[PDB]
Amino acid sequence: GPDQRAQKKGDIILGGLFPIHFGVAAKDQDLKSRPESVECIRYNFRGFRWLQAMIFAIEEINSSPALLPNLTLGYRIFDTCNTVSKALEATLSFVAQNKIDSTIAVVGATGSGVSTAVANLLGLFYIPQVSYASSSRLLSNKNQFKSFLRTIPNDEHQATAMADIIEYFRWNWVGTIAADDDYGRPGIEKFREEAEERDICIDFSELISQYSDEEEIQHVVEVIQNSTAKVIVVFSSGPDLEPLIKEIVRRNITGKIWLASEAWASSSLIAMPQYFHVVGGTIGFALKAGQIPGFREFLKKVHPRKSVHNGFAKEFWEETFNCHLQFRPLCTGDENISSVETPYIDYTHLRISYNVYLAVYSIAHALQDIYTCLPGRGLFTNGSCADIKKVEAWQVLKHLRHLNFTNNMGEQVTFDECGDLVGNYSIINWHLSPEDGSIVFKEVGYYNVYAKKGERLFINEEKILWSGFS
Amino acid sequence: PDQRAQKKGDIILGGLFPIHFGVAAKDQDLKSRPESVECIRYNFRGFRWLQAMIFAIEEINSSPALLPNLTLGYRIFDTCNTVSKALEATLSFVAQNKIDSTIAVVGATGSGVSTAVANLLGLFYIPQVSYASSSRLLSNKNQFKSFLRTIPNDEHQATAMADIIEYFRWNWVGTIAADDDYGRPGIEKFREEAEERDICIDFSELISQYSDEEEIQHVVEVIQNSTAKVIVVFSSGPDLEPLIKEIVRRNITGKIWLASEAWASSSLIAMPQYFHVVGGTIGFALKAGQIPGFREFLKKVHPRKSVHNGFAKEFWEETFNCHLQRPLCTGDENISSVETPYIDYTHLRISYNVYLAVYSIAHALQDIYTCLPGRGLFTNGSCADIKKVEAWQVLKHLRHLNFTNNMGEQVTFDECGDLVGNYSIINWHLSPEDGSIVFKEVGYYNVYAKKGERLFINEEKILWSGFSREVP
Ligand SMILES: O=C(O)[C@@H]1Cc2c([nH]c3ccccc23)CN1
Numbered sequence: 001g002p003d004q005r006a007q008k009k010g011d012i013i014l015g016g017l018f019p020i021h022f023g024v025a026a027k028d029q030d031l032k033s034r035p036e037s038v039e040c041i042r043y044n045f046r047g048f049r050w051l052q053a054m055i056f057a058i059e060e061i062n063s064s065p066a067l068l069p070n071l072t073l074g075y076r077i078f079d080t081c082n083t084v085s086k087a088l089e090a091t092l093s094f095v096a097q098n099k100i101d102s103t104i105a106v107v108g109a110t111g112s113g114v115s116t117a118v119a120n121l122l123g124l125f126y127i128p129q130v131s132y133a134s135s136s137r138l139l140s141n142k143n144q145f146k147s148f149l150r151t152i153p154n155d156e157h158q159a160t161a162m163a164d165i166i167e168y169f170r171w172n173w174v175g176t177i178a179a180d181d182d183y184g185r186p187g188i189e190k191f192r193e194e195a196e197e198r199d200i201c202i203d204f205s206e207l208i209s210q211y212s213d214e215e216e217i218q219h220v221v222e223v224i225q226n227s228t229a230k231v232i233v234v235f236s237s238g239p240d241l242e243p244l245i246k247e248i249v250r251r252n253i254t255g256k257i258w259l260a261s262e263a264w265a266s267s268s269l270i271a272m273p274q275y276f277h278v279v280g281g282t283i284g285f286a287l288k289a290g291q292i293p294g295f296r297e298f299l300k301k302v303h304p305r306k307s308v309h310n311g312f313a314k315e316f317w318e319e320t321f322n323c324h325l326q327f328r329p330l331c332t333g334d335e336n337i338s339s340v341e342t343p344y345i346d347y348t349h350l351r352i353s354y355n356v357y358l359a360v361y362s363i364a365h366a367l368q369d370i371y372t373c374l375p376g377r378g379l380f381t382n383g384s385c386a387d388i389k390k391v392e393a394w395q396v397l398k399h400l401r402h403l404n405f406t407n408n409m410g411e412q413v414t415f416d417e418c419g420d421l422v423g424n425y426s427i428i429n430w431h432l433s434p435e436d437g438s439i440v441f442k443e444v445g446y447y448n449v450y451a452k453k454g455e456r457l458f459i460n461e462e463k464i465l466w467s468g469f470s
Numbered sequence: 471p472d473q474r475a476q477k478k479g480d481i482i483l484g485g486l487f488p489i490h491f492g493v494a495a496k497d498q499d500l501k502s503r504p505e506s507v508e509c510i511r512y513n514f515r516g517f518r519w520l521q522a523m524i525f526a527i528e529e530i531n532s533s534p535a536l537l538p539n540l541t542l543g544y545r546i547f548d549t550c551n552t553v554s555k556a557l558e559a560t561l562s563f564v565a566q567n568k569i570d571s572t573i574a575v576v577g578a579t580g581s582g583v584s585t586a587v588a589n590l591l592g593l594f595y596i597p598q599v600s601y602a603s604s605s606r607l608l609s610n611k612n613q614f615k616s617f618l619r620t621i622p623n624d625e626h627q628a629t630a631m632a633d634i635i636e637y638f639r640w641n642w643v644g645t646i647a648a649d650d651d652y653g654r655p656g657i658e659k660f661r662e663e664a665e666e667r668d669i670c671i672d673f674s675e676l677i678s679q680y681s682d683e684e685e686i687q688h689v690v691e692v693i694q695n696s697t698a699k700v701i702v703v704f705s706s707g708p709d710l711e712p713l714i715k716e717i718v719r720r721n722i723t724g725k726i727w728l729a730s731e732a733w734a735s736s737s738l739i740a741m742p743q744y745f746h747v748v749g750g751t752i753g754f755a756l757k758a759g760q761i762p763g764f765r766e767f768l769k770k771v772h773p774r775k776s777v778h779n780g781f782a783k784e785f786w787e788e789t790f791n792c793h794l795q796r797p798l799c800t801g802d803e804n805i806s807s808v809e810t811p812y813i814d815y816t817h818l819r820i821s822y823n824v825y826l827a828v829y830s831i832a833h834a835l836q837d838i839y840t841c842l843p844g845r846g847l848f849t850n851g852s853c854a855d856i857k858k859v860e861a862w863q864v865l866k867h868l869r870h871l872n873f874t875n876n877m878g879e880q881v882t883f884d885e886c887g888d889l890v891g892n893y894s895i896i897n898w899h900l901s902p903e904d905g906s907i908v909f910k911e912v913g914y915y916n917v918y919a920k921k922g923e924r925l926f927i928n929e930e931k932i933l934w935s936g937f938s939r940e941v942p
Pocket residue numbers: 110111112113133134135136183237238262263264352
């Protein structure tokens with residue numbers, strides 16, 4: 001398949017898709033000569049941390065004597081660049097065998113639009129796909145997406161929570177902005193419905209994107225400038241929001257209350273100190289934090305030399321230390337990860353990373369359910385089992401549909417009729433560190449998704465900066 | 471795939487068409503290996519669309535002038551209006567390219583299907599030309615690099631709808647949309663235009679061909695519990711039909727249905743036994759087109775004689791309600807005896823789009839044949855060898871194509887690969903002779919006129935629940 005990858009031989013292979021870059025280089029093809037392949041641009045350090053979590057879990061599992069003793073799990077992991085096209089190349093390789101008529105399960109993708117395209121494909125071959133971050137309600141539809149599950153809750157809930165926060169503060173006047181894609185559009189539509197039920201009025205509603213032109217941006221900023229609304233609900237990823245924010249910062253638009261969907265509420269592309277006068281004090285959703293003992297130590301052993309199997313480790317290094325590998329200065333090889341602050345390690349809570357880790361453990365546990373299957377008390381015809389020596393993707397899907405297990409956090413992980421896994425939300429507020437001068441995601445409440453209306457939202461008003469500054 | 475239509479040729483065109491309306495929705499407990507889904511309910515109008523493609527190709531081969539050195543071939547599959555079937559087909563289209571042979575594709579129908587396909591063809595810069603997918607999502611050329619269409623996108627249609635409501639001073643309307651890339655974006659556009667005109671929306675529900683009974687009951691309840699008489703519906707017939715059945719069942723009467731073009735002419739909904747519910751709907755229709763020879767071509771269909779079109783056998787069986795060597799078929803019987811949409815039509819609209827999609831591929835190939843070195847489109851004005859053409863060269867030529875159809879019109883695609891078109895506005899009457907439903911034209915929408923001056927309606931021509939000339 002693709003040139004850049006992370007890959008290790010095993011008896012059973014797990015596919016993986018991660019956004020190691022935020023995007024593709026937009027040298028928009030006029031098709032004057034044969035199109036070469038696009039280049040991926042702007043390193044995503046957080047995304048590399050996500051990919052590490054999958055490798056950590058797979059290595060943790062091959063070490064565990066308990067879980068899958070006779071066998072080893074391998075992996076084939078690719079960069080999507082938040083791009084359907086790159087993600088589809090990689091996926092064509094995952095199903096290369098199957099298509100001619102080997103990959104047992106795929107962990108990914110991140111953006112709901114990317115996961116959709118991938119799912120349309122894997123679904124043809126009943127290859128289970130477990131996403132760590134794709135939250136569009138569209139993916140719950142099991143007629144269209146036969147093999148899709150996720151370790152993240154869908155956005156029906158998040159959008160309802162957004163409307164509940166607004167009602168909580170007795171606000172009744174807002175604007176909305178959403179990314180023009182299968183994450184933003186269905187999310188804000190839901191929010192609209194919920195806002196109406198609670199007599200919350202929406203004065204404007206606009207769509208944006210990573211690739212909006214200057215005229216389209218100017219227009220959105222004008223609508224904003226021209227509106228009495230102080231509270232602006234935004235349903236979007238970092239990359240789709242960054243152009244709008246750059247212009248809003250350029251024109252110095254100040255003291256809006258920004259309500260962030262989980263995709264941008266922790267994004268290092270928006271939570272930048274030079275934007276704080278605009279973006280300070282945003283309130284947003286985050287997934288519940290999880291714990292991976294050993295992970296931080298694993299992330300510090302990265303090395304362009306030592307790491308044979310992870311072929312993303314080279315460019316990681318170069319990006320981190322701003323050098324090149326055997327004028328861009330050459331790299332010693334002996335530089336220290338702890339000297340440069342990047343999102344790779346400069347984090348406090350593991351949230352999406354935890355989902356990656358659970359996505360892998362799900363696949364693993366469903367394989368463990370096949371290892372220990374007792375003939376007669378199995379899930380296939382006449383109580384029969386599946387042969388783990390010769391396992392087929394659809395059998396893992398089957399096992400994933402019936403899975404129930406207890407995670408290191410001591411929780412039961414099972415998937416519903418739609419392949420979703422319910423979860424609660426943290427509510428964070430953007431403060432400025434007086435120690436660092438950097439932005440700090442202060443936890444200020446939580447939303448318990450399944451609870452009687454009026455007993456779901458828990459907030460500490462005392463803790464909130466409304467402009468973000470002490 | 472087993473069931474197809476194909477013929478060898480120098481350059482192959484792909485084709486996707488909905489020969490069946492859907493799939494048998496048998497949910498799989500995956501206790502054993504899954505078998506494929508079975509396509510259910512034959513779509514005669516869809517067979518005609520596929521016929522228009524084959525017609526246009528043979529005609530083009532017959533033309534000496536257009537592409538002399540070469541013959542055009544075709545490999546043409548059934549999507550069953552399903553992403554999955556369309557993608558199996560598509561994987562075979564790209565099979566050569568992927569391994570690193572198909573030069574262009576015509577289709578698909580449903581925006582949701584063309585979306586899925588377009589993601590795939592786009593990797594390999596294989597041009598795709600849709601005769602019927604009208605989602606604005608498809609105008610986005612960053613995501614859909616190789617997509618064009620011979621149908622206008624719905625931006626105007628949804629605005630037209632809101633112009634119609636403003637005109638009659640209607641005030642608190644209902645909305646219903648198919649849950650897919652046709653319905654959601656159309657209604658999202660409609661809502662924006664309704665906001666600009668201070669038109670309020672009382673409800674908005676989603677529907678689908680595959681919605682269970684609980685999901686339908688709920689929509690029917692929302693409708694029943696509403697004061698809204700005016701209901702805007704953006705959907706295909708097949709996704710709508712389950713809803714209409716239950717509405718007719720509960721006798722829900724005197725609604726004014728505003729019909730998007732995908733169902734405004736649909737034989738699944740335009741059925742006399744629904745006329746007490748569905749009568750008097752107002753809707754949109756594409757400009758008609760003329761195809762000389764085509765009617766005659768449609769009558770030469772034969773399970774025997776048609777060696778290349780492997781859909782004809784099932785066509786025959788479904789038409790005449792027989793079996794092939796549940797009575798056995800003579801193999802002699804007359805197509806012009808049984809009334810089905812295959813031949814029972816007055817105007818060619820989508821069929822004309824199919825035709826034009828094929829000729830657009832053709833005319834872009836022709837412009838390669840006749841390229842003059844130095845005056846061409848590529849590097850240093852260079853040209854492309856037509857003996858060894860590559861899909862992306864056709865894409866390039868298709869982006870800049872400009873030619874004259876048989877109706878005497880200029881066919882070009884804009885920066886987004888779209889094509890503008892006006893609309894007729896039609897109203898659902900009953901036939902006094904026939905008892906069948908009739909699409910009477912009662913207005914037009916002219917897309918070239920300035921904002922506020924695009925709609926025209928003849929009030930006198932409207933029958934208000936199919937029958938009444940007395941309004942309020
Ligand atoms: O489905 C989607 O597109 C968004 C993508 C996304 C989510 N969380 C994130 C955190 C960082 C970056 C991207 C994301 C949840 N779902």
